[PDB]
Amino acid sequence: SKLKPFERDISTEIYQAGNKPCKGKGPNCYFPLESYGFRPTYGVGHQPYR
Amino acid sequence: SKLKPFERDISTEIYQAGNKPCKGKGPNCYFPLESYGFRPTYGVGHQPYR
Amino acid sequence: STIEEQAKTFLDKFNHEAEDLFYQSSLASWNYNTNITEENVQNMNNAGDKWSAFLKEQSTLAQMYPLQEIQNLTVKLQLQALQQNGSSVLSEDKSKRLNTILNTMSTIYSTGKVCLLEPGLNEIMANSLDYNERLWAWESWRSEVGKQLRPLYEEYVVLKNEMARANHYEDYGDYWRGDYEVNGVDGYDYSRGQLIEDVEHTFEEIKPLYEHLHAYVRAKLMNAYPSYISPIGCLPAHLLGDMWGRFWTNLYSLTVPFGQKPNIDVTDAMVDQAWDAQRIFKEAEKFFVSVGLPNMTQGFWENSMLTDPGNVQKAVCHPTAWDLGKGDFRILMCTKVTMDDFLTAHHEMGHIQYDMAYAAQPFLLRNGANEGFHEAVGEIMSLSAATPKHLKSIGLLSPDFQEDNETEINFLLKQALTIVGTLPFTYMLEKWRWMVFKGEIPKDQWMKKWWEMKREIVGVVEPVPHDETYCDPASLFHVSNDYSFIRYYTRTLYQFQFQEALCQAAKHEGPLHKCDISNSTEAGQKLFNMLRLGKSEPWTLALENVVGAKNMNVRPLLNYFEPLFTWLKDQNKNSFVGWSTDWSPYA
Amino acid sequence: STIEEQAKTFLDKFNHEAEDLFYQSSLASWNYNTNITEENVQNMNNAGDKWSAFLKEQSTLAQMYPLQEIQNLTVKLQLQALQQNGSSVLSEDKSKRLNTILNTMSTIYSTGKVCNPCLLLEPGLNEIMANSLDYNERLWAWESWRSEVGKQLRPLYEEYVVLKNEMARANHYEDYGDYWRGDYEVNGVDGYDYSRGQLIEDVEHTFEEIKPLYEHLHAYVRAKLMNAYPSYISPIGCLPAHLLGDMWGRFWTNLYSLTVPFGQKPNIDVTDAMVDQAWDAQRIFKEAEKFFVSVGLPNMTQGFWENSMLTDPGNVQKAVCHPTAWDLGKGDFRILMCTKVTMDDFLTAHHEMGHIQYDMAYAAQPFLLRNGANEGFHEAVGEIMSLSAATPKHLKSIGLLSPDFQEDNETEINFLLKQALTIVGTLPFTYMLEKWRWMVFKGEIPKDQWMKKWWEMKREIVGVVEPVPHDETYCDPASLFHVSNDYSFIRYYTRTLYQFQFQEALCQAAKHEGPLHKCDISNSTEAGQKLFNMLRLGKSEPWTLALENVVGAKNMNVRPLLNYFEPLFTWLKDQNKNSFVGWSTDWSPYA
Numbered sequence A, B: 001s002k003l004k005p006f007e008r009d010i011s012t013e014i015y016q017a018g019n020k021p022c023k024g025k026g027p028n029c030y031f032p033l034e035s036y037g038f039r040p041t042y043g044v045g046h047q048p049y050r
Numbered sequence C: 001s002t003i004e005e006q007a008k009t010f011l012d013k014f015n016h017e018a019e020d021l022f023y024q025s026s027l028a029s030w031n032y033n034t035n036i037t038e039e040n041v042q043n044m045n046n047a048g049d050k051w052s053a054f055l056k057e058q059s060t061l062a063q064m065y066p067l068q069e070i071q072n073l074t075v076k077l078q079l080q081a082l083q084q085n086g087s088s089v090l091s092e093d094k095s096k097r098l099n100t101i102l103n104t105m106s107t108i109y110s111t112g113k114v115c116l117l118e119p120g121l122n123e124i125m126a127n128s129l130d131y132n133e134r135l136w137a138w139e140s141w142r143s144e145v146g147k148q149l150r151p152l153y154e155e156y157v158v159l160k161n162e163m164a165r166a167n168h169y170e171d172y173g174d175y176w177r178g179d180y181e182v183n184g185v186d187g188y189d190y191s192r193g194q195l196i197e198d199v200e201h202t203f204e205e206i207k208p209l210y211e212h213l214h215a216y217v218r219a220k221l222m223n224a225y226p227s228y229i230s231p232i233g234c235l236p237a238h239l240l241g242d243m244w245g246r247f248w249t250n251l252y253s254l255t256v257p258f259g260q261k262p263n264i265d266v267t268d269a270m271v272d273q274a275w276d277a278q279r280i281f282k283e284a285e286k287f288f289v290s291v292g293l294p295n296m297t298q299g300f301w302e303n304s305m306l307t308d309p310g311n312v313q314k315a316v317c318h319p320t321a322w323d324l325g326k327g328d329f330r331i332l333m334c335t336k337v338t339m340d341d342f343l344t345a346h347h348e349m350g351h352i353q354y355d356m357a358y359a360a361q362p363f364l365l366r367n368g369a370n371e372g373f374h375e376a377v378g379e380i381m382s383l384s385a386a387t388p389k390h391l392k393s394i395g396l397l398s399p400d401f402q403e404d405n406e407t408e409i410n411f412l413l414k415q416a417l418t419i420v421g422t423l424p425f426t427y428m429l430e431k432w433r434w435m436v437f438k439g440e441i442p443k444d445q446w447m448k449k450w451w452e453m454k455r456e457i458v459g460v461v462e463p464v465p466h467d468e469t470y471c472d473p474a475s476l477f478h479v480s481n482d483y484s485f486i487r488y489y490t491r492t493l494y495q496f497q498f499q500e501a502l503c504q505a506a507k508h509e510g511p512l513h514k515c516d517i518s519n520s521t522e523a524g525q526k527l528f529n530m531l532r533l534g535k536s537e538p539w540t541l542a543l544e545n546v547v548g549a550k551n552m553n554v555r556p557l558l559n560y561f562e563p564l565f566t567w568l569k570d571q572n573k574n575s576f577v578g579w580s581t582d583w584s585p586y587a
Numbered sequence D: 001s002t003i004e005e006q007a008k009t010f011l012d013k014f015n016h017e018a019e020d021l022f023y024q025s026s027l028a029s030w031n032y033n034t035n036i037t038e039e040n041v042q043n044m045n046n047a048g049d050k051w052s053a054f055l056k057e058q059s060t061l062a063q064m065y066p067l068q069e070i071q072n073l074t075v076k077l078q079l080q081a082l083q084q085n086g087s088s089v090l091s092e093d094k095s096k097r098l099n100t101i102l103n104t105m106s107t108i109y110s111t112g113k114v115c116n117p118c119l120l121l122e123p124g125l126n127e128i129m130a131n132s133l134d135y136n137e138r139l140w141a142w143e144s145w146r147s148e149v150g151k152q153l154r155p156l157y158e159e160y161v162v163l164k165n166e167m168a169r170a171n172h173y174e175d176y177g178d179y180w181r182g183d184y185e186v187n188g189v190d191g192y193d194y195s196r197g198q199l200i201e202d203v204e205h206t207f208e209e210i211k212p213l214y215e216h217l218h219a220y221v222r223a224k225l226m227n228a229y230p231s232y233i234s235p236i237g238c239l240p241a242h243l244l245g246d247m248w249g250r251f252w253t254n255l256y257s258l259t260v261p262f263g264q265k266p267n268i269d270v271t272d273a274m275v276d277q278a279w280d281a282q283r284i285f286k287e288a289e290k291f292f293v294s295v296g297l298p299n300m301t302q303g304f305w306e307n308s309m310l311t312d313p314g315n316v317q318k319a320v321c322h323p324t325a326w327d328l329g330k331g332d333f334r335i336l337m338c339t340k341v342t343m344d345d346f347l348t349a350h351h352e353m354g355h356i357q358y359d360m361a362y363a364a365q366p367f368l369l370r371n372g373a374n375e376g377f378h379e380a381v382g383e384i385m386s387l388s389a390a391t392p393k394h395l396k397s398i399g400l401l402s403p404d405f406q407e408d409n410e411t412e413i414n415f416l417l418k419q420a421l422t423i424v425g426t427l428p429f430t431y432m433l434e435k436w437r438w439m440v441f442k443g444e445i446p447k448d449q450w451m452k453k454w455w456e457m458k459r460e461i462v463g464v465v466e467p468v469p470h471d472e473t474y475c476d477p478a479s480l481f482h483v484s485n486d487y488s489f490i491r492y493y494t495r496t497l498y499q500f501q502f503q504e505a506l507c508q509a510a511k512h513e514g515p516l517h518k519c520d521i522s523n524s525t526e527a528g529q530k531l532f533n534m535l536r537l538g539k540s541e542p543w544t545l546a547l548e549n550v551v552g553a554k555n556m557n558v559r560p561l562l563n564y565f566e567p568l569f570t571w572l573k574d575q576n577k578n579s580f581v582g583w584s585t586d587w588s589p590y591a
């Protein structure tokens, strides 16, 4: 679900897309976070900003 | 498009009902204005009013 | 780029141009029928050709917007109304011959006579009981007109069938059913064969009591013609007082149930009141407004001419309702202070009132749901005005006038000679025409099948069967020309189904001809809303809404005549009942 | 937890990982072509195999989200792009042999040489034939190639066809030609579906409509080549195949020097102006940038200029260099060129930059749908940039073409002939080749008859007769890189029809008058926005609809082809009224 104002959710629990109970990663089980790829050659909308 | 309050439009630009430009009238080229035709024998909703 | 959006823009343009050209055509035609002169003929023909030219161009453009891509059923139906090619699909040489034939057939109809044809031939038969005079007039006219009418009728049928095939119909009879079947809608579709069978089944369901009327009338003819009428076989057609066979009404003076019981009438009151054409219509308007039907506006009253103007500006004296468009509604009639004119004023007012209601829709939908509903609505208000309770309510019927059942029986017999006597004949004629267009009967057998089916369906036959050289059916005005007769039979039932719903709204217990459906404002307003539907909502749903069924309803007709059928049952015990096809007046 | 919601989660994850993994592959490929090293080969191989394994695994996971249960449509389409089995159904030994035979066919084609009266066919022998004035050398070259290389490709070509058909059955198609036709199918649309059979029928009907220009053009070409070699070529008979100057038969550019309407009339060539004006090659690129801004399309990113490598690597980095546009993912757009101060490089620069205008607009869509509407749109739109680059209005307004230039109808004819001969002369070739490949994959024609059928199709469809009879051992179509390799030729025909339909659609938006080759798209910001409205859709929308919003038609029309070459078609008719029109298929040097 969506976060509340100023809420900081730092959970690392694996999210399961389906009904089947899932532990760890799997076919329909994914880590909530994804990394950004920052490289000096990426375009303006993909570059990192502080 | 529709008019805004107190907006007046005096254009007679022909509307093209398809995806191509059209010079003058045609099968799907519609002149935006139509004339009136008033006769003394018309009904209350059809007679001219000032 | 979407077909529906382009179709809507097209139809809006169409409706504007169509309405202006419609007015020009209807006004020029009004002026000609209103004032007979060469100048109005010139305007009539020029405006008519211009309007038709417009429609052919708009049909060509309508065909560029396929019906299956339209989600708005109103738009889809309007496109369907324009996509039909009609007369434009037939090859030019076939069209040239077809139009030559129609004009020749009409010319022949008017050219022939009983050795002038109109109205004298029916006056001769209707006003004389001499068996031989009616027989002579019958044979004398058909011997002059049918010889020239047959070849042209047969070619007309073949060319119209070619037209229908070009329009994706099996034959022209199927083409007509295509015009009567509902289209432009989804899930209410009916098959043309089903419309045909529904009418045939309805006929067979009403027939068993019609045989009781037929036995009664045959016995009365026996009384008039003891040496010529068989109690078992077919009745002579020339004794009906109608060379065409359409009506049995001129037998009324012979068949009156109770001679001592005059029919209920107020004519004496209109004569002492001296109601003019405009007051007959305005009193009818008072009735119509109280019923709940829309009021007739001042424009109609000043523009219409309900009187005979005289020889200086002679009018065509054929009561008709005219819809000119853009609010211009008129009735042309030559009204006399009679009961037939009183009821005629109600028929044409209701007819134009239908036109008034449909004018609120788009031009392509400013047509009635069914051709039979305009006449049915007129006939309903005519019947309602005819109802003794109405005549009592308006106050024209003498304050001390007392109605009874036997007078109503005399009334019902006149109504039966008009409806019961005509329905098997008109039904038969429409089926005969269907077989000639369909091509079921070889051309050289069209008259033989007529004779055979006339014996089985109608029970009144030509006093002498005609030769294959002559086409007697085509001597009838509506057979010679391009006309579907399904609308007359079905219009009667349309009238009875509507009458049933109006009677139920009145909530009177008794026979359909007795209940007073005057006033009952909600019932008239509901009928008005049905009128407004025009072609926007199919005629089959209007009928379903009045009787709760997609099928034609046998019950209100038989319930209307039930006191008469009871009388006939009392007379039928002595008469032979049923028609044999083995014996004819000739044999 | 239903199929649509899980499909949405799955594809979003796939798009994130796909951008990073493809990018690693695209970087390795760029860096390798820029600088050829052992390390760059390992980067290409590692990124390629990891990305491929990734795609195979995600396709397998895609299979658990049935397409028919999804009501979203966008993910449905993304899954349709991902769901195709490819090699997963085909037996392991057939898959291994199919990859081996494709690599072998490519290797033989690119390493097999034709020994001089040894030289590689592409580009060496083709260049010699194109520049040579002796038809006997071209005839020898065709026979020598069949003798030296065709015998090496034929038996493998036949096995290749069978193995590809087996894969096509594994993918539920009648043959591999049908598999290629399937790239043009859409579904879930309001009457926009085209079938494979309809694609073929549309091509054949379009050719029947094209034919009058092809025949008038061909009659002119055939008669001019006959006048060039009147002792060999029949005045009635069709032209010999070796005379084309292109061993493949695809490029009719090698006949132009023999068919020049007037020896004294020039073609437009602005190379001398750039040199005399001392313009840098990167300036003609900057001028193309100015053109794109003027049309009304997005401006080029700074990342392009910094990441692109437009000049020839020369002798500093070992490199492979050719014009090409790259989309590396995540906003990284660049072009690789061997740029020169010449008109040919200018038109190429417009072609390749336009390809980046499209990749920049495609970036609005998810990675898996980050492509064009169809296979032929990319080159067709680059050709749209090329056509506006070629017209004299464009060149004169920039200043590449002299400010005192005035139109000369005969010069316009010389330009139009060269262009029609290249662009139109190839059209019936491309068609008979695609159709031949289709019949070959279908299996309707026996393997031995295939060579007959190719010879007959050349004669019947383009008026080209092989001067030397060949047996089954030799294979003529295999002389083209794309026949030995895995390539669908329907897209070249389709690209060109898209190209001319686009020139007309943008001409109508531009509101220009005159011959369609005269009509430009420079400035004309209505045409810019009209084009921008499809560029942003790419592969995500039905390609038939994606083109429909611009061209105004349910399918493509020939009419813009005749409009482009209208002065040429008229001129050709005027000369053809006196010359023989048509060709005899009975005449053959063999006979």
Ligand SMILES: *[C@@H]1O[C@H](CO)[C@@H](O[C@@H]2O[C@H](CO)[C@@H](O)[C@H](O)[C@H]2NC(C)=O)[C@H](O)[C@H]1NC(C)=O
Pocket (backbone or CB within 6 Å): D294, D393, D394, D396, D397, D398, D522, D523
């Ligand atoms: C597109 O429009 C621009 C102006 O917005 C044109 O640029 C001018 O071209 C003429 C050519 O002789 C130059 O003299 C002007 O100095 C240019 N103006 C600017 C501001 O650079 C451009 O030529 C137009 N495109 C075409 C093909 O004509």
Ligand SMILES: *[C@@H]1O[C@H](CO)[C@@H](O)[C@H](O)[C@H]1NC(C)=O
Pocket (backbone or CB within 6 Å): C031, C035, C036, C037, C038, C039, C040, C313
């Ligand atoms: C009626 O017809 C006569 C013909 O003599 C004509 O003069 C007159 O104007 C007509 N009146 C109208 C109203 O059309």
Ligand SMILES: *[C@@H]1O[C@H](CO)[C@@H](O)[C@H](O)[C@H]1NC(C)=O
Pocket (backbone or CB within 6 Å): C405, C406, C409, C566, C567
């Ligand atoms: C009319 O009603 C009276 C009531 O007594 C009855 O005797 C008579 O038979 C009825 N007539 C008919 C025709 O029903």
Ligand SMILES: *[C@@H]1O[C@H](CO)[C@@H](O)[C@H](O)[C@H]1NC(C)=O
Pocket (backbone or CB within 6 Å): D060, D063, D083, D084, D085, D088, D089
């Ligand atoms: C091939 O694709 C279909 C979906 O069309 C899928 O059901 C089947 O399991 C796939 N087979 C393999 C081996 O991936």
Ligand SMILES: *[C@@H]1O[C@H](CO)[C@@H](O)[C@H](O)[C@H]1NC(C)=O
Pocket (backbone or CB within 6 Å): D293, D299, D300
């Ligand atoms: C487009 O980009 C170039 C890059 O050098 C810049 O010079 C030019 O002003 C830009 N134009 C617009 C309209 O942003």
Ligand SMILES: *[C@@H]1O[C@H](CO)[C@@H](O)[C@H](O)[C@H]1NC(C)=O
Pocket (backbone or CB within 6 Å): D035, D036, D037, D039, D316, D317, D318
């Ligand atoms: C090519 O790449 C290798 C390995 O990264 C590098 O050592 C070499 O200097 C590069 N060549 C040039 C000319 O930069």
Ligand SMILES: *[C@@H]1O[C@H](CO)[C@@H](O)[C@H](O)[C@H]1NC(C)=O
Pocket (backbone or CB within 6 Å): D409, D410, D413, D571
């Ligand atoms: C070019 O125009 C001249 C007239 O100025 C004409 O004689 C000549 O035939 C034209 N050439 C073409 C190819 O239209």
